[PDB]
Symmetry: D2
Subunit: 402 residues, 4 copies
């Protein structure tokens, strides 16, 4: 009994959980985070009311998702375990934070979610909830015996049918999906056998690289403070100079050319290896563009220190520690390194690949004249000394193990 804010999506799990928490005594507040997925939110709201929700909040959270979450992730220049661009992992603290906000506003003692007992997301939601509101209580049905021993997915379907929970007819895929503005992830079902290949009908956000356009899209991406501020199509003249709008245009450009597809096995914070395929179109373009622009504008030695911090950032976000003193310090250090990260990157998007074509920047650390056929401000005799003393170690070390 009391009021619970449930992170609700409209699917079987969270439809059932709504009804279940209601059967258990709770007044349920259905909370629909609109984060760039393809939902008919109004109908999901109607469905939630029919199901017995006391209240429905649809929060459009896309712009702040781009600007407060995706932007620092690009600044980081880092990939979880050298492959994962963190699409879902970034979204959870964005979702959880608004959920806590709705709960404290409503005077609700409990929050709730439909994440499974073997996942990362359970951790991410709940670490942010406790971090931001130490006194909130969580109900995670998939970790409740009374719940998880009863619905041992076809047991859940039956539960739906018995309580008149509607099942869309659209029909089910033998995997689960997570979709937001940044990516789409597909993970259970048939994909659990890491020997088995994605069927072609799996890929919903990117074109098949064999069907993709024959002409590339050539874009110019402008950065300031490590994040994109402008996208212009060099050919057709299209321009976007606001965050969400440029990001979606990059999704639409990259998806059109089949860009952003990975197939990976990853290691889950609880310690299970999991097999996932991902579609991160815009994220893939920006990952590469940003690397090129920070490398052009950053000191060599700042960069290696900064990249260690990013690596740390990637692991903290993946495991669910966005709202922590350590990720806050790390985000601050990463932000600081990006002060001069600005300029323009020319890129080409074609057949499932992004290509860097050129770059320029008024804050460039590049010196065309110095690296030159012409001399210039350099003494070749210096280098001789530099080599010769770097070798002293090296010649010691040989003579003395000889």
């Amino acid at each position: 009994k009391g009021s619970v804010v449930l992170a609700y999506s409209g699917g079987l799990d969270t439809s059932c959980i709504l009804v279940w928490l209601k059967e258990q005594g709770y007044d349920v507040i259905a909370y629909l985070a609109n984060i760039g997925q393809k939902e008919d939110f109004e109908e999901a709201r109607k469905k939630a009311l029919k199901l017995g929700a006391k209240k429905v909040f649809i929060e459009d959270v896309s712009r702040e998702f781009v600007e407060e979450f995706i932007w620092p992730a690009i600044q980081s220049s880092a990939l979880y375990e050298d492959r994962y661009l963190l699409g879902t992992s970034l979204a959870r603290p964005c979702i959880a934070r608004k959920q806590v906000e709705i709960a404290q506003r409503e005077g609700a003692k409990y929050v709730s979610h439909g994440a499974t007992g073997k996942g990362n997301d359970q951790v991410r939601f709940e670490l942010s909830c406790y971090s931001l509101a130490p006194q909130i209580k969580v109900i995670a049905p998939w970790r409740m015996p009374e719940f998880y021993n009863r619905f041992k997915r076809n047991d859940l379907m039956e539960y739906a049918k018995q309580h008149g929970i509607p099942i869309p007819v659209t029909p089910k895929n033998p995997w689960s999906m997570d979709e937001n503005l940044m990516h789409i992830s597909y993970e259970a079902g048939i994909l659990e056998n890491p020997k088995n290949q994605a069927p072609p009908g799996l890929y919903t956000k990117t074109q098949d690289p064999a069907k993709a356009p024959n002409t590339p899209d050539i874009l110019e991406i402008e950065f300031k403070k490590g994040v994109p501020v402008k996208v212009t199509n060099v050919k057709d003249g299209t321009t976007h100079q606001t965050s969400l709008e440029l990001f979606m245009y990059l999704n639409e450009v990259a998806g059109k050319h089949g860009v952003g597809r990975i197939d990976i096995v990853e290691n889950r914070f609880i310690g299970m290896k999991s097999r996932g395929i991902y579609e991160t179109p815009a994220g893939t373009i920006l990952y590469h563009a940003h690397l090129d622009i920070e490398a052009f504008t950053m000191d060599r030695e700042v960069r290696k220190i900064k990249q260690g911090l990013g690596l740390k950032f990637a692991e903290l976000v993946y495991t669910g520690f966005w709202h922590s003193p350590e990720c806050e310090f790390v985000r601050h250090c990463i932000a600081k390194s990006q002060e001069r990260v600005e300029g323009k990157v020319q890129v080409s998007v074609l057949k499932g690949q992004v290509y860097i074509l050129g770059r320029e920047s008024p804050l460039s650390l590049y010196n065309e004249e110095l690296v030159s056929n012409v001399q210039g401000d350099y003494e070749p005799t210096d280098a001789t000394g530099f080599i010769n003393i770097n070798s002293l170690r090296l010649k010691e070390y040989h003579r003395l193990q000889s």
Copy 2:
């Protein structure tokens, strides 16, 4: 005076240097490292004799280049500054080591090279020479005033003409190339303006992704101890189970599909930023395949420690410290992590991109049953404790800065 072993390639710089060291008193031993480039070595030998070389050594160094250099680089899973696969950087210690070997055999007091005063390669050659033979002497003409002030590239052409040094007619490109078995690099001339895009005729080793085959090549790559031992084409049945032969077939497959192209600005050991484009076809396939197979067969926590070592490996190789106690220790630690890195990766090569399709391994750390819709060996109640104590910090830290 005395005998000098010159790392000779047959191009303008090292043709001129041969003649110059000869004019200076030295007996010149011309040393042609055959490392998978496209030279007519026999003619380069003839050219070296005509030029006044006392002696010519052509060393076919390809197999040991793959097995002793490229193999540990793949084990490392690392990229210099997140982009560079180290093609040229790996080759130098292979070349320098054989040069020192030829010099000590011949009783030659000096070795020599045609690397410029602003490069990485000068460092790599000479650090390995001193490391392996502390008493050898180096002649690096590009760092000698008597030499570099006189040939302030058209001054070098004149020198050639005046000493009857032949100039191929093939004509010059407004950039310099470095080619070996692993890659091709292009760097000076027009490419020095990082705003300027590679002209299409630049790309000699990879197909244009717009001209590349419409059907992919699907390959199965087998690893053992972190390095490829087998490549089989799933369609046409082609099989290679020896190191050099599988590597070249992967070059030929990846080059055919336009795979392995980068355009980057990098930071040079002497501290100048430089602009380079690279073609690393096989290297690009193996980079991705190996990542997938180590991730499937490696403990999560071994992996992050191991990846720090790889990062260290990448920097040590780039800067020229292959032959050092620190790179030796690092290579040893990296090798040790790879003991269980084995299995089979299914990959697709199409339109300038490599795709992972699936993987399997008898040393897999994957548990299909555990990660599953079915229960299994897991207690969902555990995770609740795991979350709740990970939050204790986190809730402390909020209350106490409140």
Copy 3:
């Protein structure tokens, strides 16, 4: 019901737990790890039998504790959070491993321990048990509601009195102690207020530095492969050339001079900060001696890579991950670095401090002649080049943010 191997010490907690597990249905095997503490093990055995133990194992585990645990810890050159020498943290995997060994021999389905619910040791025992024997079951009464809600320390005393559990008369100190061969730790009770100073009667293993001898003890410590193999007193001639015997002599020497005292606040694996004072006499001498000898015999760059691994080692041991693939890999890498770590360190032990006096080694990387008033094998002109190119960055970076 069934048989349980209880890590038993003879104190109130584990005396009560013995009786409690017996009341609960279990046959209790009392397991006394002799690890260099000051117990009357035979009487603790008698006490355990009187209490209803089916069986008593006293295992003298000291020599293997020194040689398999303390030795790799010294090789590591690392301190948990720059202060803690890990005395108790090292002991647990030594104790747990023998416990699992006794349990599997006996055909016992369960193991048990008296560690509290807020500690590190619960984690260390149980992570090693599961790691070494995935199928064993743990009973940790302090985490059982039926147990911990009933004995909310005076409730435990009453339980003792009501079951005729003997209480020594020796009387209690308002803190808890953990003692082994390596150290003694004191932690709860009055010490929980980190503002409060240790009372003088707290310190049982080290002399008060104000009462300590006026003449120092000067010792020569010999290392091989990073671990001490010989201790000789320079004055009185005492010599120990076996592991356990030299270690105890160093405890006895350091304790005599008041060496090895710390007072720290540390952060506990579950995330609570805790206040602890420690006495690690021999450990403190060896920490300093070994640092001096590895620094004399190790390459500069091997050292920083190695020290990162040690840091990792310290955290893995503190948190309870000795028996893990990551600590195993790290111990292996650390061992490998120590191959040349050998020689002789002259040290002085006086008034709560250790002093390094000198050192020597046939595997020294020191060059007296080179570092010299005399020239020698060096070119001062080299250094000029080395400085000048290290500055190129540095001068770039100024001009280009000017």
Copy 4:
């Protein structure tokens, strides 16, 4: 010819260099950095004028040395190679910066110093000079053939005698000293044999721990933002609440009790190992006090990230890169971590050792109640889940290499 600012100390080397640069055509500006050493600066000024200096600048640089250099070094909590507190290494950028400032004011084209060709200090002076003023020119006589081949220390003495350069009568020690406010270092001569022990008359700044007071000094040190702001003697009531004054009082307290003595072999930026003994009295107290106060007030995970940065700081300072973008970024990150580092540490100074006695802070992350015999805000059942899922890896990893 032209004007040169020489970092002058008044000793044989820099007295001779003054006269030599004058003989070579230059107008010499003698620059005496007063950095807390024991010079009679007025007489050194008189000596410099007699010697032919056009000008003499005595700069009292002590307060800014403490506040801008030593303070960030304490914030760092780090030791070069786990032993060296960086006394001399910190001073050089302080000295070099004022030298560049004097040179640019005077319109002097050149700066100069008497550091040897095999040292660290040559690097530190000159990297800061170039970093701060890319166009200045350096004269480093010890790297000039015309100079260093002529004064092959008794050749320098003769040079003095022949030019009427006064030699103090005080007589020479068979080692060189470097002294400032932070420490004293002794290094060449007899100490070059790392087997040889410091003679007792070597130690000028610290009492012999055998002669040191029988009663300790108990001090309370207050920190704010990671740096000491107050020192009060608990017994005698002495109080210092300004930076330089508290630092000197801590030198005077620690020196009185024999605190701050080390004997080490270190590895020099050019790659030679060197043997040095150091006396860092106040630095030693503050190193330990600050560690205790940051550990009490810092998040566990902020701390390990922060300590990596400090480690980086220590190496950047030792090698001479204070004035670099990477040390600037690192100092900024380190400063940021210290925002909450504040409170009071009770310490005891006795017989060559410092002891932590207690600590307190209004920004404490310590929770007496939580870590407690009393329950409190904790669920012991949580920890069971935390252990059990930390073991899942661990049990996997065993079954799958079984």
